[PDB]
Amino acid sequence: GPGSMKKSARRQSRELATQGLYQWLLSNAAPGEIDAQLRGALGYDKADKTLLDTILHGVIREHATLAEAISPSLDRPIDQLSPVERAVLLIATYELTHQIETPYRVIINEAVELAKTFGGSDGYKYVNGVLDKLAVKLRPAETQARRGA
Template identity: 60%
Template sequence: MKSARRRSREFAVQSLYQWLLTKAEASAICAHLQSAPGFNKADREHFDALVQGVTRGAGALDAQLAPCLDRPTQELSPIEHAVLLIGAYELTHHIEIPYRVVINEAVEITKTFGGTDGYKYVNGVLDRLAAQLRATEIKHASR
């Protein structure tokens, strides 16, 4: 059974995928998704935080991701890009969520929505980003 947080991340990926492709207003995209089956089981507060945080801070999040990528963000699949943006946002702004949970959730969502081996790429990128953003947490976790 999926947790409410997992559902919020899945719906956030769908919203951000559409936002990346169409550049439509995030609020309109979110309003449309609210009628999707299963949305009522999602953590609405986390969903809102993810979509609003990513759409408002996409430039800064892309800048954080850039050194961890092997290509420009424009060349990423929109699903991988959306998942990476969410992962970067959570690593930066939700330090109460352990870095391993952020990475695992991103990998699992990419397995569901992304290409065949996209999850491997997402895992590697977020692992490098976590090493930069959560070095102290990683150090303590390895003890």
């Protein structure tokens, strides 16, 4: 399973978890509703840099299944967690799992691209603004490099 050659693989599962815990404390939705994301994507077995390769294939293949997996994971239908909320949370986390060290630029870009259909004029700025706040802490040097042209 997880390599964890020298230092614990547990870090990865935490970096995955912080997404859900953030959405929890930030969106202030019911614990289980958000917790469900891990019921669909079990972090334990996938928490390690070796599994990431497995994960990207799971992204290309099981993206749709993952998105749908939220509905049977709860006692309630998929739409409980608002369209934008779930759209961003599930995809961003699934990517984050294998993109923990990847530029927020690309992750946010993709998130914004999805936000188009879900939130449109509000959504694309909304998702940028919410992720930005973390990015300025997890990658300050890059966030300070704001190039308009």
